[PDB]
């Protein structure tokens, strides 16, 4: 399963540098690509921006990516999964990144929008959400977990992709959360569809306490904790390797069931996947707010 991680504009180029599975750096400003450690580098919109001073316009970023679509395709060629981020800070990349997402999706890569940028900015987030399979919000200091935990992460996004295709429990729209994120239930509504939106908490753990640890993590964020209480329904999944016991599975199931309403309809699922080793991953999707 080939994963390709793509940072776009100033913030994504730094994100990718921090992270250095294959990496691609994309920028409308060619100068910044001289500071890139990524093996694959793409200047986008060279003809569009020729002679211009460097700029902050997202629309330029967007039109630059459409001009360069062909070169982006070749670089992404052969990816099963694509992470796209513009990282921190604003610029052309917030315009460019959703196009890069859309391009990958149409090559049939499962496509995750990764948002490290604080918001309630949202101009960009709204557009990324429109363009991607699943959108994940993760804190900037935690960015490394997406590439360290890439295997459990990808199982989480595959589940999120599957819920959305089959409209499970009526879910037409979804945002994933990992780690402790600065959003409350507002900041979220204004950017999400009004019926059948959902929230996916994700947590990943290894070693001694791994099952209870991972379940607590998936519900730990401000967004998940406030929204499990109201939830009309909850989809939970735990995925582990050959070593995942019924004990671990039942224990994690318990922890989630308690946070949820006594009257919630919970779907509970358990997967033994030898691909995971000693890692386990728990996903919690609340819906019906």
Curated annotation (Swiss-Prot):
Binding site for GTP: 10-14, 18, 54-56, 91-93, 140, 161
Subcellular compartments: Cytoplasm
GO biological process assignments: division septum assembly; FtsZ-dependent cytokinesis; protein polymerization
Effect of residue 182 to A: Lack of GTPase activity. Does not polymerize in the presence of calcium ions
Endpoints of the signal sequence: none
Residues forming coiled coils: none
Gene Ontology CC annotation, any one: cell division site
One Gene Ontology term of the molecular function aspect: GTPase activity
Inhibition and activation profile: Calcium ions inhibit the GTPase activity and promote the polymerization of FtsZ.
Keywords: Cell cycle, Cell division, Cytoplasm, GTP-binding, Nucleotide-binding, Septation
Protein's job: Essential cell division protein that forms a contractile ring structure (Z ring) at the future cell division site. The regulation of the ring assembly controls the timing and the location of cell division. One of the functions of the FtsZ ring is to recruit other cell division proteins to the septum to produce a new cell wall between the dividing cells. Binds GTP and shows GTPase activity.
Family to which the UniProt record says this protein belongs: Belongs to the FtsZ family.
Subunit structure: Homodimer. Polymerizes to form a dynamic ring structure in a strictly GTP-dependent manner. Interacts directly with several other division proteins.
Protein name listed in UniProt: Cell division protein FtsZ
Protein species of origin: Staphylococcus aureus (strain Mu50 / ATCC 700699)
UniProt lineage: Bacteria, Bacillati, Bacillota, Bacilli, Bacillales
